[model samples]
Target: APIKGVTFGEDTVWEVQGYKNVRITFELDERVDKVLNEKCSVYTVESGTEVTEFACVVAEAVVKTLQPVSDLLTNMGIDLDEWSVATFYLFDDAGEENFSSRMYCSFYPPDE
Candidate 1:
């Protein structure tokens, strides 16, 4: 579905494969790595136990939504293997929905 109209900051969303606890986050690993240089908080997943564990634990959750996320990944020219998806929500005042009125799944390139 096309997103709802809004006038301010970018209100966007996407669905991740294989997980129900999917959350729209301001947190992107590559983005965080780029802007931060703090030694105390620096940790790269490229070669670590954390990456291995995350791959194993989150794999099932992610795979469930893989097809949709993969299609989006291809259209956006991003490698699905390297990116996390962000699902967005819109409000419907007419329906009196408290949380999300509509939803869309998408990806964010590190360039953004």
Candidate 2:
């Protein structure tokens, strides 16, 4: 199965400076879940002192996850009036019998 639906949380958090965290509930597609697990991590800014930012991106690895579901992911990004480039990952909580699972990502400022 593919991603059933998605939700984007546009709010930025001060907990970890320059962050845009999003929560996504997705299907148990092996390809999707595995890639999410592998690439799942905090995004960082290489050159913090840049012109400005939307903190946007899907990361190199994140884009791998994106390629398979770019269709849905596109709309998800389109839904972003103030979203960062984020990818999905395990909730540290999921199951084979469950209909679906939840995941999250912490997107950070652009790398300049």
Candidate 3:
């Protein structure tokens, strides 16, 4: 089967190809705070700077989140595919934290 979708906490669920029928749970690390506000376009001084900041932060977050899913599958003896399609139902503001505090992305786990 291919990838299905990702559930961002309990807020939303998105679907995509490659990653199918896999439920992943992701939690944001507090260390990401430094870039949260600075990265948001709506709350930054320079639009360009905002975009750049958000890009950097997003890049970091994507990689950070993907690692866990990869590891989770590995631990379960599942071989995670590198090019699996994934839909991110990301709620930039996920929990009791600020509006844009907790973020999570869930994607389908590839089978061996």
Candidate 4:
């Protein structure tokens, strides 16, 4: 199935091994990470105590989503906290059919 009608923001088509992937990239504030993570992982599985333990630990250093800006500012000047890169993935349901289908959108804090 194809994405129908007009949609907000730019849309890119990516395919690999017969699979379709829709990727959207943008920016957001660090404060919004919690909300984005919550929406993205709504259907995620929870397994063990180790996961919760790890989540409790705080990040010692700020992870820069914009590498060039981060290096230029922190190394060359002040560590000005700016917008963080954010990505969203919307996938067509595996069981998609003309009669019944589903679509899923997941957002993540940039990539590693």
- Tens-digit lDDT track of model 2 for 12-106: 33332433333233442344555545456343333232212212342344454536655664565432222333432223243221111233333
lDDT of 2: 0.35
Tens digit per residue, CA lDDT, model 4, 1-112: 2333553334453221222322211223354344333433222112222222211221111133234345555665444352222223333344221111233333342233
Clashes within 3 Å, all models in order: 14, 1, 8, 0
The sequence of per-residue lDDT tens digits that candidate 1 reaches over residues 11-103 is 433221211221222222342222212222221122223212332333334433343445665666645564334322211233221122221
Clashing pairs in 2: 57-85
What's the distance in Å from true for residue 28, model 4? 2.3
Q: List residue ranges in candidate 4 displaced over 4 A.
A: 1-16, 29-65, 71-112
Worst 10 residues of 4 by lDDT: 53-62
Please identify model 3 stretches exceeding 4 Å from their true place: 1-79, 82-84, 92-101, 106-112
After TM-score superposition, the amount by which residue 77's alpha carbon in candidate 4 deviates from its true location, in angstroms, is 14
Which tens-of-lDDT digit does each residue in 8-78 have in candidate 3? 34433332232212112253234432332233313211212322243334444444344545666556554
Better of 3 and 4 by TM-score: 3
Scanning candidate 1 in windows of ten residues, the lowest lDDT window is 16-25
* lDDT to native, each model: 0.30, 0.35, 0.34, 0.30
TM-score of 3: 0.24
Per-model TM against the reference: 0.24, 0.24, 0.24, 0.19
lDDT score of model 1?
0.30
Between candidates 2 and 4, the lDDT winner: 2
Error of 1 at 76 (Å): 0.7
